[PDB]
């Protein structure tokens, strides 16, 4: 998810 992969997609 985006959300869940925003946070190593900075």
Do not use: V
């Amino acid at each position: 998810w985006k959300l869940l992969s925003k946070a190593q997609e900075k």
